Amino acid sequence: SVPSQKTYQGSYGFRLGFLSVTCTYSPALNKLFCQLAKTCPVQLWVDSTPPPGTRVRAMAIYKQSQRMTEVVRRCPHHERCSDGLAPPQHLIRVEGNLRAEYLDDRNTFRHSVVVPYEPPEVGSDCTTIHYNYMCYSSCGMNRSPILTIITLEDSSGNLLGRDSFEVRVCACPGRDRRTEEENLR
Ligand SMILES: [Zn+2]
């Protein structure tokens, strides 16, 4: 099957916000450009605070319809390049969170990383999670565009909110964003 990518703010008004160049986001393209394994700050914005026990899941899928049913995973080379937490096959790793869970779906084999939802920190109206992408789009992905889907869920896995963004992991993010944005125009 294919995970839904439909935007859903839900009851809590959930949506994402974003911040040489290691990571840069294009609102026009709803696309994040980042370097391999570097810190990617993704902000969680809500209108009302979800309950304790709420969880935040990140999962990658292929954007192109002809490859949507495929599981996004690291190429063989990058499975060997680690924190000893993220399974080597996982594309998305969370940095700086002691409670990251790395999961593999029983039936779909899709990977995801989950962390507990935390209310915004002082000096901020949002919660920031630091993600790292462990394989280049050109590797595996082999130049195919991927989407990262972030879902806000309750403790039993029920959907509370969903948002998503395209991602390109590349050596020169700033330059590639510029290229794709200029092309858009
Ligand atoms: Zn790779």
Side-chain angles (χ1 to χ4, degrees):
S1 56
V2 182
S4 165
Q5 68 186 74
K6 177 71 177 191
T7 299
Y8 173 58
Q9 292 185 38
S11 299
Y12 303 93
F14 169 82
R15 70 287 186 191
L16 302 169
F18 305 81
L19 287 191
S20 60
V21 50
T22 45
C23 185
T24 183
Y25 176 77
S26 169
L29 297 163
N30 179 207
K31 183 165 176 168
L32 180 64
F33 297 79
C34 62
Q35 287 188 323
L36 183 66
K38 306 296 188 172
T39 304
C40 298
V42 176
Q43 313 173 326
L44 308 183
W45 289 80
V46 291
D47 292 330
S48 52
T49 312
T54 297
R55 292 156 63 77
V56 183
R57 183 189 308 270
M59 180 188 285
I61 64 167
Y62 283 110
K63 178 190 181 192
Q64 299 162 304
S65 57
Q66 31 208 64
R67 209 177 175 193
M68 298 184 302
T69 56
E70 279 204 67
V71 171
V72 174
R73 57 189 295 180
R74 286 148 75 167
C75 70
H77 175 251
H78 280 113
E79 290 184 312
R80 302 177 166 148
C81 282
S82 168
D83 53 7
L85 300 163
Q89 307 72 29
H90 284 226
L91 172 69
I92 305 180
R93 164 173 86 184
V94 165
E95 154 182 20
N97 190 303
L98 302 183
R99 287 301 184 256
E101 294 175 26
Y102 290 89
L103 308 171
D104 307 76
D105 193 285
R106 242 273 165 179
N107 306 73
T108 75
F109 288 83
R110 289 179 191 282
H111 305 148
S112 61
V113 55
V114 178
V115 293
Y117 168 82
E118 298 174 7
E121 69 184 309
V122 173
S124 178
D125 289 353
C126 61
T127 296
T128 301
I129 294 176
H130 285 161
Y131 288 112
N132 298 154
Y133 291 79
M134 310 303 299
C135 192
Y136 290 113
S137 292
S138 64
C139 290
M141 300 189 269
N142 193 57
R143 298 192 182 184
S144 280
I146 62 165
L147 254 59
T148 291
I149 301 170
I150 303 300
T151 47
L152 192 70
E153 310 177 355
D154 72 4
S155 55
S156 307
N158 291 300
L159 176 74
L160 295 179
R162 188 192 295 110
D163 198 350
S164 62
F165 54 96
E166 186 174 333
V167 176
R168 175 182 169 78
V169 184
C170 55
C172 310
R175 183 248 273 142
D176 289 347
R177 171 184 174 183
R178 195 178 306 144
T179 300
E180 286 181 42
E181 283 185 323
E182 291 188 300
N183 275 50
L184 177 64
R185 176 185 47 55

